[PDB]
Ligand binder design. Structure first.
Ligand SMILES: *[C@@H]1O[C@H](CO[C@@H]2O[C@@H](C)[C@@H](O)[C@@H](O)[C@@H]2O)[C@@H](O[C@@H]2O[C@H](CO)[C@@H](O[C@@H]3O[C@H](CO[C@H]4O[C@H](CO)[C@@H](O)[C@H](O)[C@@H]4O[C@@H]4O[C@H](CO)[C@@H](O)[C@H](O)[C@H]4NC(C)=O)[C@@H](O)[C@H](O[C@H]4O[C@H](CO)[C@@H](O)[C@H](O)[C@@H]4O[C@@H]4O[C@H](CO)[C@@H](O[C@@H]5O[C@H](CO)[C@H](O)[C@H](O)[C@H]5O)[C@H](O[C@@H]5O[C@@H](C)[C@@H](O)[C@@H](O)[C@@H]5O)[C@H]4NC(C)=O)[C@@H]3O)[C@H](O)[C@H]2NC(C)=O)[C@H](O)[C@H]1NC(C)=O
Ligand SMILES: *[C@@H]1O[C@H](CO[C@@H]2O[C@@H](C)[C@@H](O)[C@@H](O)[C@@H]2O)[C@@H](O[C@@H]2O[C@H](CO)[C@@H](O[C@@H]3O[C@H](CO[C@H]4O[C@H](CO)[C@@H](O)[C@H](O)[C@@H]4O)[C@@H](O)[C@H](O[C@H]4O[C@H](CO)[C@@H](O)[C@H](O)[C@@H]4O[C@@H]4O[C@H](CO)[C@@H](O[C@@H]5O[C@H](CO[C@]6(C(=O)O)C[C@H](O)[C@@H](NC(C)=O)[C@H]([C@H](O)[C@H](O)CO)O6)[C@H](O)[C@H](O)[C@H]5O)[C@H](O)[C@H]4NC(C)=O)[C@@H]3O)[C@H](O)[C@H]2NC(C)=O)[C@H](O)[C@H]1NC(C)=O
Ligand SMILES: [Ca+2]
Ligand SMILES: [Ca+2]
Ligand SMILES: [Mn+2]
Ligand SMILES: [Mn+2]
Lengths: 181, 50, 181, 47
């Protein structure tokens, strides 16, 4: 049973488990992806590669990730753009920033992207986001347009606990965000 | 006080390679906010026999 | 709180979650550190750095590793040189080979080492191995002259299930080698 | 059924850095043998 696990509850200046890309850095004991600055992209990856499935069996892994995040916007009206947990090839580099969350380069289906991602998008991009224009949790796969979304009320400065799980057998991804208080 | 839940059947093997890297990503554009992860736990298990 | 775990049953041709050093590689489900070849040093460390002890609190980590290594020897009269499981600084690089198991330099306590290492020495080296010769398990700390030893009867060609735990509290390192037959 | 045990007291703090990299090692010299591993398990729990 190939396995991989880790728990982190105190990020530090020298926190070697992770890989920092873009403007990502670890400050105030928390993983800082971006700050209240324009046009930035901050990504952080777990150093060790994980075996998600096997060819000579066709077995797919079974996993779970749990994390607490905080989106703190100076102004609660103008918020952008989004946070994201992603699964990408072993040698991922930051992609297009801005509305493309740093993991994708276009709206079209890019088969070679090989990146699936559960996004928490706080900015309506008329070119590809749901017409209702609500902040939403979305499941992307090889493109910035979500294959499914759920409207979500961002609580400026509050910390939501997210729990994402994957069942290799039924292949159903599950995502849950919860704002305690 | 509020909770959201979403889930879609995503056949991971056909979009992602056997070996993969995971992590977080966040960006900003004309408008912005600060995104920080205060904690992170991850566990993956995979059986090895057809 | 800060956990790190991994289980590897079979090592594939490409083992992403590992960093190979020296002549170490893989061949048919198993990891191969050395072949039956004169003078060789092959190491394999796990890709992601481990948080062993926290200074801020002074707490040390409790940990347990387990594995099944095996020593293939043509003739059981002239076996060398050994095997090791080390705990070294992140930037650890192969050191002196041969009697030093590629982990240490000199038989003196060199502080620079910062690498503790349990070993299974299969060859008698005078100025640092027990006078009675005898192959043996042996704990090390910054030197090749073991901190303690336990004679061991090498069972050539036979795999050996070993477990090694550590109690961060009672600071007791329990090495444990058992032959499944 | 044949075991060997050895549990000594060693304070890792006083010796290894906070962040370490664990792994295996093997060598040869004038004498030799093939040293190979078959499975590996590990787990750290630091509070
Ligand atoms: C008060 O609130 C108002 C209302 O807010 C809105 O409503 C609320 C209810 C709520 O929903 C809010 O969330 C919501 O915002 C505020 O007014 C709104 O403010 C928004 C912020 O600016 C603004 O949206 C922005 O729009 C621009 C695009 O506008 C032009 O292009 C449109 C097509 O995309 C086109 O339809 C428009 O018409 C317009 O075109 C012309 O523009 C002229 C000048 O503006 C104008 O005069 C013309 O009239 C107009 N044409 C016509 C016909 O009218 C868009 O670019 C912004 O998008 C960027 O940010 C969002 C997230 O915030 C990302 O999703 C997106 O990916 C973009 O991200 C990156 O932005 C960077 C800059 O921040 C780009 O960079 C450039 O780099 C160069 C280098 O030198 C230079 O520095 C530039 O200055 C930089 O911009 C970056 O570049 C691209 O990506 C990189 C990777 C490369 O690929 C590069 O080649 C690319 O070009 C870009 N990256 C990407 C991937 O795009 C944003 O959407 C709203 O329109 C505006 N009004 C309304 C009604 O909504 C008001 O400001 C608030 N006031 C206060 C005080 O707070
Ligand atoms: C039948 O069986 C018999 C008997 O077997 C024994 O008995 C049975 C019952 C059983 O117990 C067996 O286990 C027993 O083996 C067998 O005959 C015996 O065979 C043994 C194996 O050859 C012999 O031992 C060897 O002896 C040599 C020479 O003498 C040693 O001892 C001296 C006193 O202690 C010492 O001062 C010498 O320096 C030397 O150490 C020795 O070299 C051998 O040691 C190597 O191998 C062992 C085991 O593999 C290993 O643990 C050692 O660390 C060492 O490993 C590496 O080996 C390679 C390959 O040979 C060497 O490569 C050469 O390196 C040099 C340069 O390296 C130096 C240098 O000059 O820089 C050499 C320096 O001496 C060294 N100095 C020091 C202080 O270490 C330096 C220094 O380390 C530097 O810092 C280096 O970084 O390195 C050149 O590059 C050459 O080109 C290159 O080839 C490596 O140097 C070496 N690495 C290191 C770090 O040392 C081993 O100890 C027995 O003597 C012999 N006779 C008897 C009566 O037992 C018989 O053959 C069998 N026959 C059959 C048919 O089966
Ligand atoms: Ca958006
Ligand atoms: Ca030896
Ligand atoms: Mn979206
Ligand atoms: Mn020894």
């Amino acid at each position: 049973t190939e396995t991989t696990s880790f728990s982190i509850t105190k990020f530090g200046p020298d926190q070697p488990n992770l890989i920092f890309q873009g403007d990502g850095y670890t400050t105030k004991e928390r993983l800082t992806l971006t700050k209240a600055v324009r046009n930035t992209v901050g990504r952080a990856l777990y150093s060790s590669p994980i075996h998600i499935w096997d060819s000579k069996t066709g077995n797919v892994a079974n996993f779970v990730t749990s994390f607490t995040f905080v989106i703190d916007a100076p102004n609660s009206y103008n918020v952008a753009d989004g946070f994201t947990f992603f699964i990408a090839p072993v040698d991922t580099k930051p992609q297009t920033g801005g509305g493309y969350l740093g993991v994708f380069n276009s709206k079209d289906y890019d088969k070679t992207s090989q990146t699936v991602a559960v996004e928490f998008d706080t900015f309506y991009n008329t070119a590809w986001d749901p017409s209702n224009g609500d902040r939403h949790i979305g499941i992307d796969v090889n493109s910035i347009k979500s294959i499914n979304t759920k409207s979500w009320k961002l609580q400026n400065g509050k910390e939501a606990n997210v729990v994402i799980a994957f069942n290799g057998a039924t292949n159903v991804l599950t995502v849950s965000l919860t704002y305690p208080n | 006080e509020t909770s959201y839940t979403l889930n879609e059947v995503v056949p991971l093997k056909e979009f992602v390679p056997e070996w993969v890297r995971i992590g977080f990503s966040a960006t900003t554009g004309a408008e912005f906010a600060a995104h920080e992860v205060l904690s992170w736990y991850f566990n993956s298990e995979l059986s090895v026999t057809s």
